[PDB]
Write a protein that holds these residues in place. Structure first.
Motif, short mmCIF file in Angstrom:
data_model
loop_
_atom_site.label_atom_id
_atom_site.label_comp_id
_atom_site.label_asym_id
_atom_site.label_seq_id
_atom_site.Cartn_x
_atom_site.Cartn_y
_atom_site.Cartn_z
N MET A 1 3.11 -1.37 4.17
CA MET A 1 2.26 -0.16 4.12
C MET A 1 3.11 1.08 4.36
O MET A 1 3.82 1.17 5.37
CB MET A 1 1.14 -0.26 5.16
CG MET A 1 0.06 -1.21 4.73
SD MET A 1 -1.24 -1.57 6.09
CE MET A 1 -0.11 -2.61 7.20
N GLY A 2 3.09 2.00 3.42
CA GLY A 2 3.90 3.20 3.50
C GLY A 2 3.13 4.47 3.74
O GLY A 2 2.03 4.67 3.21
N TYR A 3 3.71 5.34 4.60
CA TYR A 3 3.15 6.65 4.88
C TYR A 3 4.23 7.72 4.98
O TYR A 3 5.38 7.38 5.21
CB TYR A 3 2.39 6.62 6.19
CG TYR A 3 1.29 5.55 6.32
CD1 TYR A 3 1.61 4.24 6.56
CD2 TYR A 3 -0.03 5.87 6.17
CE1 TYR A 3 0.61 3.28 6.71
CE2 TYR A 3 -1.03 4.92 6.30
CZ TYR A 3 -0.71 3.60 6.55
OH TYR A 3 -1.70 2.64 6.70
N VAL A 4 3.84 9.00 4.86
CA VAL A 4 4.76 10.11 4.84
C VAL A 4 4.23 11.27 5.63
O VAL A 4 3.07 11.29 5.99
CB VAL A 4 5.03 10.60 3.39
CG1 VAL A 4 5.90 9.59 2.64
CG2 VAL A 4 3.71 10.89 2.62
N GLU B 1 0.92 -1.14 0.00
CA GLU B 1 0.00 0.00 0.00
C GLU B 1 0.95 1.17 0.00
O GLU B 1 1.57 1.49 1.01
CB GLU B 1 -0.93 -0.03 1.18
CG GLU B 1 -1.87 -1.23 1.13
CD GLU B 1 -2.94 -1.24 2.18
OE1 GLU B 1 -2.95 -0.36 3.08
OE2 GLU B 1 -3.78 -2.19 2.12
N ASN B 2 1.16 1.78 -1.16
CA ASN B 2 2.19 2.81 -1.27
C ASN B 2 1.75 4.13 -0.62
O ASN B 2 0.58 4.37 -0.32
CB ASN B 2 2.62 3.03 -2.74
CG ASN B 2 4.06 3.64 -2.92
OD1 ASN B 2 4.88 3.75 -1.99
ND2 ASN B 2 4.36 4.01 -4.17
N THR B 3 2.73 5.01 -0.50
CA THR B 3 2.62 6.27 0.26
C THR B 3 1.70 7.28 -0.37
O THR B 3 1.21 8.17 0.32
CB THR B 3 3.98 6.94 0.38
OG1 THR B 3 4.53 7.13 -0.94
CG2 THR B 3 4.99 6.14 1.23
N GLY C 1 -3.59 5.59 -0.94
CA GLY C 1 -2.34 5.07 -1.43
C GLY C 1 -2.63 4.06 -2.54
O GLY C 1 -3.61 3.34 -2.44
N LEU D 1 5.14 0.09 7.53
CA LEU D 1 4.66 -0.97 8.39
C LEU D 1 4.73 -2.28 7.63
O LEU D 1 4.07 -2.48 6.60
CB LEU D 1 3.22 -0.76 8.84
CG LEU D 1 3.01 0.03 10.12
CD1 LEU D 1 3.59 1.47 9.94
CD2 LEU D 1 1.51 0.03 10.52
N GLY E 1 9.14 9.45 6.46
CA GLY E 1 8.09 8.43 6.29
C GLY E 1 8.31 7.22 7.12
O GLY E 1 9.25 7.12 7.92
N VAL E 2 7.42 6.25 6.93
CA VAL E 2 7.48 5.03 7.67
C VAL E 2 6.85 3.92 6.83
O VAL E 2 5.90 4.15 6.04
CB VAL E 2 6.69 5.13 9.04
CG1 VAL E 2 5.19 5.40 8.81
CG2 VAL E 2 7.01 3.91 9.94
#
Ligand SMILES: [Cl-]
Ligand SMILES: [Cl-]
Lengths: 122, 122
Positions: A117-120, A42-44, A50, A105, A102-103
């Motif tokens: 799973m990416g977030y920013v 699940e991209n950022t 995402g 998971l 970012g991070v």
């Protein structure tokens, strides 16, 4: 790698080391062996949800491109592992000289990454 | 709450339940007792770094405003706990009807939240 003691925590740490090295060394050779057939990213971007990438091929292609894009890099802030899960905080540096924190998971099953799973910062 | 078995995992789950309820019930009364004197929030915006809020007062003020802003809410996707850490994935609904997915990385010490790091899809 900060390890929370748990059954497979050491295994997950080893997976995250090899995963992180792909980006640090700009070398995607390890990606396929680390990724489950059914792996989902699940991209950022883009909000709200995402994008989604499914299957080993799509996940290898995306991460390979990321790892080898000229003028870009990642600084690792912290990798925290517990059981079959991990979090990887990072700072991504873009070709234009900007960066973003970012991070990821991460979740592993049967010794391979099944979920990322990416977030920013937005 | 998904719990990874670990010494204080059950305690951290209890803290996250009460923390999450502040937002679900739009009721910030519990916030101060859950937050360490030195608590830091690294908020979701703005890139690159996210703002920073430090100290119990700042953290209570920010979360209280978030919890009580008319026309806004959160759906909880998953709370995962391990030891003194947790991740809380969520979807935030804005007054204009839009939403965004995000995540909080949470850390507790001495039974109170000392660190909360927020990220979003960008
Ligand atoms: Cl950094
Ligand atoms: Cl959702």
């Amino acid at each position: 790698i900060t390890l929370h003691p748990d059954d497979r925590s050491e295994q997950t740490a080893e997976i995250m080391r090899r995963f992180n090295d792909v980006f640090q060394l700009h070398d995607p050779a390890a990606l396929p062996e680390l990724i489950a057939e059914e792996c989902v990213i699940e991209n950022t971007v883009p909000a709200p949800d995402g994008a989604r990438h499914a299957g080993r091929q799509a996940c290898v292609q995306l991460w390979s491109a990321i790892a080898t894009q000229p003028g870009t890099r990642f600084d690792l802030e912290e990798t925290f592992v517990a059981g079959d899960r991990a979090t990887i905080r990072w700072r991504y540096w873009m070709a234009d000289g900007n960066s973003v924190r970012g991070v990821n998971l991460m979740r592993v099953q049967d010794g391979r990454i099944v979920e990322a799973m990416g977030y920013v910062k937005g």
